[PDB]
């Protein structure tokens, strides 16, 4: 049969930009790079997680 149902979504893009480093936050921002984050202080590094949305 094969049903072609590519239906989009309207999701409230909730992304609190300027995500600090939990414990270093007040005084040490989380180095936000285009591809990831890093913390020259406690070595806390995190990647810009690709938002795998169906649409
Ligand atoms: Zn840190």
PDB file of C-alpha atoms in Angstrom, residues 23-45:
ATOM      1  CA  UNK A  23      28.022  25.733  39.341  1.00  0.00           C
ATOM      2  CA  UNK A  24      30.319  28.304  37.656  1.00  0.00           C
ATOM      3  CA  UNK A  25      27.368  30.199  36.165  1.00  0.00           C
ATOM      4  CA  UNK A  26      27.594  33.371  38.308  1.00  0.00           C
ATOM      5  CA  UNK A  27      31.078  34.498  37.282  1.00  0.00           C
ATOM      6  CA  UNK A  28      31.881  31.989  34.537  1.00  0.00           C
ATOM      7  CA  UNK A  29      29.711  31.931  31.426  1.00  0.00           C
ATOM      8  CA  UNK A  30      29.622  28.770  29.319  1.00  0.00           C
ATOM      9  CA  UNK A  31      31.706  29.518  26.206  1.00  0.00           C
ATOM     10  CA  UNK A  32      28.942  29.317  23.606  1.00  0.00           C
ATOM     11  CA  UNK A  33      30.465  28.446  20.243  1.00  0.00           C
ATOM     12  CA  UNK A  34      28.513  27.932  17.013  1.00  0.00           C
ATOM     13  CA  UNK A  35      29.008  24.158  17.303  1.00  0.00           C
ATOM     14  CA  UNK A  36      29.275  23.624  21.082  1.00  0.00           C
ATOM     15  CA  UNK A  37      30.007  24.993  24.565  1.00  0.00           C
ATOM     16  CA  UNK A  38      33.004  24.837  26.914  1.00  0.00           C
ATOM     17  CA  UNK A  39      34.078  25.998  30.386  1.00  0.00           C
ATOM     18  CA  UNK A  40      37.667  27.114  30.872  1.00  0.00           C
ATOM     19  CA  UNK A  41      37.486  26.595  34.629  1.00  0.00           C
ATOM     20  CA  UNK A  42      36.143  23.090  35.379  1.00  0.00           C
ATOM     21  CA  UNK A  43      36.441  21.597  31.891  1.00  0.00           C
ATOM     22  CA  UNK A  44      32.674  21.428  31.439  1.00  0.00           C
ATOM     23  CA  UNK A  45      32.126  20.977  27.699  1.00  0.00           C
TER      24      UNK A  45
END
